[PDB]
Structure formats: C-alpha cells, structure tokens
Design an enzyme around this catalytic site. Sequence first.
Site, PDB file in Angstrom:
ATOM      1  N   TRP A 133      -4.146   4.053   4.837  1.00 45.47           N
ATOM      2  CA  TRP A 133      -4.359   2.795   4.088  1.00 45.47           C
ATOM      3  C   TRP A 133      -4.464   1.712   5.186  1.00 45.47           C
ATOM      4  O   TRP A 133      -3.971   2.068   6.243  1.00 45.47           O
ATOM      5  CB  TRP A 133      -2.790   2.575   3.628  1.00 45.47           C
ATOM      6  CG  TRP A 133      -2.697   1.065   3.036  1.00 45.47           C
ATOM      7  CD1 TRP A 133      -3.306   0.337   2.010  1.00 45.47           C
ATOM      8  CD2 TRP A 133      -1.495   0.307   3.331  1.00 45.47           C
ATOM      9  NE1 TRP A 133      -2.898  -0.612   1.891  1.00 45.47           N
ATOM     10  CE2 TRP A 133      -1.578  -0.938   2.729  1.00 45.47           C
ATOM     11  CE3 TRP A 133      -0.350   0.452   4.044  1.00 45.47           C
ATOM     12  CZ2 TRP A 133      -0.802  -2.019   2.444  1.00 45.47           C
ATOM     13  CZ3 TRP A 133       0.522  -0.541   3.889  1.00 45.47           C
ATOM     14  CH2 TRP A 133       0.332  -1.688   3.314  1.00 45.47           C
ATOM     15  N   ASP A 214       6.017   7.114   3.778  1.00 48.03           N
ATOM     16  CA  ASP A 214       5.805   5.921   3.289  1.00 48.03           C
ATOM     17  C   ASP A 214       5.923   6.446   1.687  1.00 48.03           C
ATOM     18  O   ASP A 214       4.776   7.097   1.366  1.00 48.03           O
ATOM     19  CB  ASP A 214       4.476   5.366   4.026  1.00 48.03           C
ATOM     20  CG  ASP A 214       3.997   4.104   3.209  1.00 48.03           C
ATOM     21  OD1 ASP A 214       4.860   3.709   2.250  1.00 48.03           O
ATOM     22  OD2 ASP A 214       3.226   3.385   3.193  1.00 48.03           O
ATOM     23  N   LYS A 250       4.380  -0.705  -7.726  1.00 47.02           N
ATOM     24  CA  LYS A 250       3.485   0.115  -8.797  1.00 47.02           C
ATOM     25  C   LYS A 250       4.266   0.784  -9.854  1.00 47.02           C
ATOM     26  O   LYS A 250       4.136   0.519 -11.040  1.00 47.02           O
ATOM     27  CB  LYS A 250       2.690   1.059  -8.102  1.00 47.02           C
ATOM     28  CG  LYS A 250       1.035   0.517  -7.665  1.00 47.02           C
ATOM     29  CD  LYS A 250       1.144  -0.071  -6.403  1.00 47.02           C
ATOM     30  CE  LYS A 250      -0.387  -0.435  -6.176  1.00 47.02           C
ATOM     31  NZ  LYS A 250      -0.541  -0.975  -4.725  1.00 47.02           N
TER      32      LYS A 250
HETATM   33  C1  LIG Z   1       0.724   4.046   1.251  1.00 54.08           C
HETATM   34  C2  LIG Z   1       0.764   2.800   0.864  1.00 54.08           C
HETATM   35  N1  LIG Z   1       1.880   2.178   1.406  1.00 54.08           N
HETATM   36  C3  LIG Z   1       2.589   0.965   1.367  1.00 54.08           C
HETATM   37  C4  LIG Z   1       1.820  -0.176   0.829  1.00 54.08           C
HETATM   38  C5  LIG Z   1       2.218  -1.426   0.421  1.00 54.08           C
HETATM   39  O1  LIG Z   1       2.290  -1.992  -0.772  1.00 54.08           O
HETATM   40  P1  LIG Z   1       3.126  -3.090  -1.283  1.00 54.08           P
HETATM   41  O2  LIG Z   1       3.030  -4.072   0.024  1.00 54.08           O
HETATM   42  O3  LIG Z   1       2.523  -4.263  -2.187  1.00 54.08           O
HETATM   43  O4  LIG Z   1       4.624  -2.857  -1.747  1.00 54.08           O
HETATM   44  C6  LIG Z   1       0.606   0.412  -0.122  1.00 54.08           C
HETATM   45  C7  LIG Z   1      -0.006  -0.658  -0.827  1.00 54.08           C
HETATM   46  N2  LIG Z   1      -1.355  -0.851  -1.363  1.00 54.08           N
HETATM   47  O5  LIG Z   1      -1.451  -1.916  -2.067  1.00 54.08           O
HETATM   48  C8  LIG Z   1      -1.430  -3.214  -1.325  1.00 54.08           C
HETATM   49  C9  LIG Z   1      -2.881  -3.582  -0.869  1.00 54.08           C
HETATM   50  O6  LIG Z   1      -3.812  -2.720  -0.469  1.00 54.08           O
HETATM   51  O7  LIG Z   1      -3.168  -4.846  -0.593  1.00 54.08           O
HETATM   52  C10 LIG Z   1       0.273   1.756   0.148  1.00 54.08           C
HETATM   53  O8  LIG Z   1      -0.868   2.218  -0.594  1.00 54.08           O
END
Ligand SMILES: Cc1ncc(COP(=O)(O)O)c(CNOCC(=O)O)c1O
Lengths: 401, 401
Positions: A133, A214, A250
């Site tokens: 990510w 994560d 989510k």
């Molecule tokens: C593996 C993973 N970890 C952690 C996270 C963090 O998600 P959040 O901060 O919404 O809880 C995400 C979230 N992605 O969605 C948010 C974006 O791309 O702007 C994620 O995919």
Amino acid sequence: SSWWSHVEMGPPDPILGVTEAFKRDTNSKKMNLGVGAYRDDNGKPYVLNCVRKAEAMIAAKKMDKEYLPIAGLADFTRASAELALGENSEAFKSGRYVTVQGISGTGSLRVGANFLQRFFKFSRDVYLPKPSWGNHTPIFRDAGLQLQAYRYYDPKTCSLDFTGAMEDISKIPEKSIILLHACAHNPTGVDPRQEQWKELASVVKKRNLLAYFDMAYQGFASGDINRDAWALRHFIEQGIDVVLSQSYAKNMGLYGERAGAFTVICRDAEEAKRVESQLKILIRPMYSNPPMNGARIASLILNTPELRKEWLVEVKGMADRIISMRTQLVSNLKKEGSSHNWQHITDQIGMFCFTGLKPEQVERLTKEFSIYMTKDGRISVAGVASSNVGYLAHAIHQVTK
Amino acid sequence: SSWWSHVEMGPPDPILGVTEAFKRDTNSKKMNLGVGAYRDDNGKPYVLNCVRKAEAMIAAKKMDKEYLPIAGLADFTRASAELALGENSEAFKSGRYVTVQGISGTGSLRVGANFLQRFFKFSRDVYLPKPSWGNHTPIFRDAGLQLQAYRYYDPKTCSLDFTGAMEDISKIPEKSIILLHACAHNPTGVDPRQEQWKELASVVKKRNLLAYFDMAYQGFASGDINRDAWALRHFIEQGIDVVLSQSYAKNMGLYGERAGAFTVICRDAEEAKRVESQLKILIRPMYSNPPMNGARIASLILNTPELRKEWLVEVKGMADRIISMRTQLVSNLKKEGSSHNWQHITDQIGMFCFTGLKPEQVERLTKEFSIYMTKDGRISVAGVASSNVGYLAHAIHQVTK
Ligand SMILES: Cc1ncc(COP(=O)(O)O)c(CNOCC(=O)O)c1O
Ligand SMILES: Cc1ncc(COP(=O)(O)O)c(CNOCC(=O)O)c1O
C-alpha cells in the site's frame, strides 16, 4: 512575512487524477475502478444496518462528550483484542497484550511506528512486500525508520512469488522488522495460502524477526472473522509475539469515523502495563486522546450480541458480493471468447485485483470504454456491479484480444 | 521474544492522581478542583443544547460515513478560519490563509510543530511562556524542535511579569518561533491586557518572529468570541503572519469528538495552495484523514444562523458561571476575615486559576477538607459550584490564616 516562499507545490496524487477524470466523463457507461471504499450493487456508499442501530442507541442514552482516556474506550480496546486474537486465545486470556485506540488503521500504524522508533533498540529496518500500500512508505519513513523490501508479487503469474519471498526473508538479518498483511493484500489481492503461511511463520520464528501485521480487512475478505485472522493467530501460536494494526474502516463501513487499534503482544501482563504506560506518553503529544464516535459504535456492535450477530451477516454480504463480481467477471470473459488465463481474478482475495493488464491496455480502457483505473492494472472490485460486470468483461477482451 | 524487557514503567500523571484520589474519598463535601472540563452548577458534564440540535439534524439526513479529504471538511475549515480571523478580516477575504482540520487542539498543534520542523528553516527554537500547559513541551520536543522560554507569570503578584516578558522577547534571536496563548492562559489564567498586547505585537514585529497562537478558549474565556480573538486579529492587522491552532473542546463542549484546525497565514492565495499541498503530504502518514463527527456538528452550528445564535448564548452562559465562581470565592474569603490579597482570583481569566497557595497548604486542603487540586496551587474553577464556593473559601482561609 515571506516565511513560506521556498515551499514548493507537492506532487499530485495519481489516484485523485483518475477520479477527477471519471467525474468529468459524460458516458453513462463510465465505471470507476479506482474507488477506495465499498459500494453496493447500485454503486452507492453503504452504512451498515447495525451501524444505524448502534448510532440510534447512543442518541437514546443521551451520552456525554467527555474526553476518553489516552488509550481510548476500554470497551472498544478489549473487544478489539478479542476480535483479533480469538476468545480462547492464550494471549488474550492471560492478558499479555496491550491494545490502544488509534485513528483508524493509518493512525494505529503510525503510533506503532513511533513506538518502534523509540523502543525497538535492535534495528531500524522495516521490510515491506513488493509491492505494498503506498502509504506504508511515508508512515515508516516519517517515524524515523529505514525501509527495505522482500519479493512478494509475481507478474508472470499475478500470484505469490513464493520462491522469491522465502529466499528474501531467509536473508533477513536477525531482529529486523517485517510488515505482513493479515489478509486481502493491498494492492494485489494476492495472499499466501495456509501452507505457505506455515512455512513463513517457521522462518520468521527462526530468523527471530519482529512481525508487524497490518489487519485492515478482517471479515471483509472471506466473510469469516476466524478465517481472516488465521495467519496472525498461527504466528502467535507458534510463539511469535507480534505487533498489530486493526482498522474498522471496511468491515464496519466506519470510514470517516476513524476507528482502529494498535496491539502489542507481550511476555506477560506485567510487561504489558509497562508498554501501555510508554504508549500513553507517546500519544499524548500526538493528539492527547482519540475520537469517540467510531469507538462507541464499534464497541456497541461487538459487545451487543444481537448487534454482533447482525454485523456478521452484513460483513458476509459485502464479501460475497465482491467474490460474486470476481466470479462473474471470469465467466463473462470466457463467454466473450477470451483465450487468456484469468484464474488470478478468482484466486485473488478482497477489494483489490491486479489484472495483469499493461499500461497501454489500461489507456484503451479509459479512452475507449470509460473504465477508470490506475496504470498498474489495479482494479477496485467495489466498482463492479451486476449491471456492468458484462460490459467490463467485454472491454477487457477487446483490449486483450 | 523478550523484545520489551527493557521498557520501564513511565511516570504517573499528576492530574490523574488527583482525580483518582478524589474518587477514593468518602467525604460528601469533597471537591475535585483538578477537572479539565467544564461542569455545570450541579457538578455535571454539559452537552450544549445547540449540540443536541445539530446531532438530530445530521441523523435526519441519513449521512454516509465516507472518508473526508485529507484536509478535512471544507465547510468546517472555512467556518473555522472565519470564526478566528473575522468575517471581514483582510486575511480572510483575500484567501491568503490555509486551514486544515486537526484532531482537536492537541492534534492541530502537532501538525503545526511537524510542519515547522520540516519547513521552518530559519530556526529550531520555540519559546514557551513560563509556565505553559505541560503538553506544550513534548508536542514540540517530539516534533524535533528545541524549547526555550520567556518570563510570563509573576509569582510575587500572581500576575503578569510584563517587564520580564518585554525584556525576554526583546532578546529573542530574530526569526525564532514564539508560542502565545490567545486568551485564558493555561495554567495561570493570567493574560496581558489589551494595551500590553499592542506592545508585545510591536516587539514581535521588530524581532521578526513567527508567532504561533494557541487558541483553545475562544468565546469560553469572556463570553465574547470577538473579544477573545482580539490579540490574534491585532497581530495579523499589524502585518505579522501568524500560524494558529484552534480547539472546539471547551467552547462547543466537543471534548471527545476531537474538532480542531491548524491555520497558516500566508503571503497570498498562491502560497496558501503550496502550503496546503505540503500539509496534506504530512498528515497522510500521520492519520490519513480526520474524524468526521465533531467537524460535522461544529460546521452545522457555525453555518446555521439559528444554531450559531443559540451557541453564543450557551458559550456566554458558560463564561459567566465561571466568572461568578471567581467573584464569589473572593467575596467569601473576605467574608471569612481573610487578610490576604485575593484580587488575582478575579483578575484572572478562564477555567484555570493560579491561587498562590503553597504545597503544604494544598496538602492540608486535601487531607483536612477533602479538596483535590495539584500542588502547584492551580484549581479548575469548573469544579466550583454555588453550593460549595462557601466551603472552598472557609478551607482556604483556614489554611492561610
Ligand atoms: C493494508 C492497508 N492497511 C491500512 C490501511 C489504512 O486504512 P484506514 O486509515 O482507512 O483505516 C489501508 C487502507 N486503505 O484505504 C485508505 C486509502 O488508501 O486512502 C490498507 O489497505
Ligand atoms: C492552551 C491549551 N492548548 C491546547 C490544548 C489542547 O486541548 P484539546 O486537545 O482537548 O483540544 C489545551 C487543553 N487543555 O486541556 C486538555 C487536557 O488536559 O486534556 C490547552 O489548555
């Protein structure tokens, strides 16, 4: 004064780029495959039923808006640990974990990163799978840590580069940090299978690495809370004391309320209290105390049997629809006469799917079919609906034939 | 394992100790003057009526829970700038400012600190008043800055050491960063008078320092929002481009919802956009996007004439209760035959009062009267009720005679 004259315009987000174009497009067949949140069969946002009910309950009780403790809402943290570890988990029953409320998954990651920078005396290197990510980079980088990588994704097959991973992890200097996605890897959708997980644990355990999980899609991935936390629980069972980040963005549709937790598996309850004190000293000067809405809603659902029950049906609904779309997509491509192998599409788990499309094809898709996605061939499965899975199958074919 | 064996138990919080101690007390006349939040006449938390009205409006609409932009809710940020700067402020009207939503006051200060660490190349030095809110230290320190101080509070008169302040600021290296509390200094309740503020401006202007305003009590200090923003607005008018942190914790009773904002006064609209771009890049790896609830409520109130109007009545109601308790403490102290000068009590502004009491007196107070406060002689006026103000007065007289 002219204090900021030397401040340059930061670069634009490629992701925002795609959604801006999508918005301009007037063709009613347009599809937005760059979307980062769940969408129902109608292409609309979805607030869970159990969320509305929890919310309604809070209103009814006329709760105050008082500051929460630094570590957050105790009913939320406890429930968070229980959700992740499992009820009969030794870790949990022995109370040798410390869970703190964080600003969703992102905040929870950051806090954990700041905690390692401070106290993880053994190394400053964080190894991320290739790819990971986007946010993972700056999170660790900003916290003062060093970035490394390990092979993960295999472009040949649009699957796990198992041989590559194993060889990479095998050469990790002992007492280093490794970031692993519990399930529904972002952005590929490529997750290890049970057997692969067991060999991964063995080496993590062998090379005595600090495993940082994560866990942002628990329940949202397979539709089963237990199945989704499998790898993480396996590691802890094998004696690997992990660090973990949980997000409810989510699985609960809590996106903007920002509810999450950061957890530390400790040797015991004694040590857990010490770590907790240190985590509190760190968070105070960051934001003092966390947003209460999201936690209140999350706590009520997990803590209220009638609500929790409804929550599992609902979460399952979300996951079933995404799988459905994946299924329909492969079947429809065959139906179009695609000679190509599209199994990956159904092997991949969660919201993201790495199609294997090349940059040029993506362009044709955008320019010719009004299908919006990033140039890496990554599609958000949330943007697929029963009403358009056919169209997408059509276009993919046209551009791959 | 055993990654954490070396992590030691962190220092106990003082504030916390007094609340805890208080809790465990059996006296029916016991008092908690350690409370960090406003309390009504019955010693109870108070959710504004305008707040409940706002929540009910949001509920009726059936709003989504989608992610807000990194910078936060646009209706919130615009309204925030407007409340601070003033509707017809030139800084407001030209669009030469940038305001991003923060996690209440603490979070806003932190973003600001991180921002300065990154882009304020002219110095690493931040000057806090002596004394300041405890949290002020770790915020800056953790951000990567060096702390310095300027004389502020005069222990001998329990008033402002104007002379020492003026001399200290005069000697502050040029282009240094200086932290100023907009109104209701925490913890002393000692604020410069309008005329002294005008003098401070001139010196700050001359030494060409970056003034960082901390505005956590706008409208809650004196009952008047404009009057409270006086000093802030005067600096800007004088041509000093400040940076500022706002909190809606106290003024709207949004404690746990965490509604705040960080603002940078720029040269123009053009530089404002460069700065905002950079602030986004900074927050992303911190927490992605801000909690929506507080911002929603805040924005509704600020933007709806009817609610805004009721809000101003409630805030005034709050400021007056406090001012009343101060007025009544003094008068009851005289009544008792106390011969000491207690004018400071009424001279001081906001929730916090530096009484001048010494440690051992504080001790007797706790021990003998069941009055809970910090040993620095600071009391939260919020903890004083009409029903117990007499009790307080007697105790203090007893201990000071
Ligand atoms: C593996 C993973 N970890 C952690 C996270 C963090 O998600 P959040 O901060 O919404 O809880 C995400 C979230 N992605 O969605 C948010 C974006 O791309 O702007 C994620 O995919
Ligand atoms: C000058 C000042 N700035 C900034 C702040 C930060 O307040 P908040 O983070 O609640 O908005 C405060 C808050 N003080 O009380 C909060 C607490 O002790 O928990 C403050 O007094």
